[PDB]
Structures are given as structure tokens and as C-alpha cells.
């Protein structure tokens, strides 16, 4: 928040709670799981 330094949105820097129909402002954006490609 204090210094601009962009990173890819992954499941390692976010968390989950609920379904995206109660928050107002839920941009449908693809979140990247690290294990899914690397394992496969």
C-alpha cells in the first residue's frame, strides 16, 4: 500500500471467504495456483 510494486495474483498472497455475490465490486479475474502447472 505504501510503495508501488506489482505482483501476480496467486493463492499465496490472497485468501478466500464466501461466494462472489455479496461483495460489491468483485472483478472476475483469473487467480494463479502455483502447484497446478508445476506438478503437471
Amino acid at each position: 500500500r505504501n510503495f508501488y510494486e506489482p505482483q501476480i495474483i496467486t493463492t499465496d498472497n490472497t485468501f478466500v471467504s464466501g461466494n462472489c455475490d455479496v461483495v460489491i465490486g468483485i472483478v472476475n479475474n483469473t487467480v494463479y495456483d502455483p502447484l497446478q502447472p508445476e506438478l503437471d
Partner: protein, 43 residues
Amino acid sequence: VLYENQKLIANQFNSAIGKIQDSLSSGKLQDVVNQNAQALNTL
């Protein structure tokens, strides 16, 4: 917790400002004025 509860927290804040108005409408500033006035009058 904020984001699924926005409208409620909203409503409570608006209602809280609502009652703050009536609470004010219905002394620590008055007292300094009163003290200065009484001292001038005795002088």
C-alpha cells in the same frame, strides 16, 4: 467482515450520527467563559 457487512455498518453509522445530533441539541466551554467574566466583573 467489512465487505459482507457493508450496508449494515453503513446504516449503524448513519443512525449513530443521527442520535449524536439530538444528544448535542439536548459545560466545559461554558465554564471558562463564566470564569473570565466573573474575574472581569470583580475587577
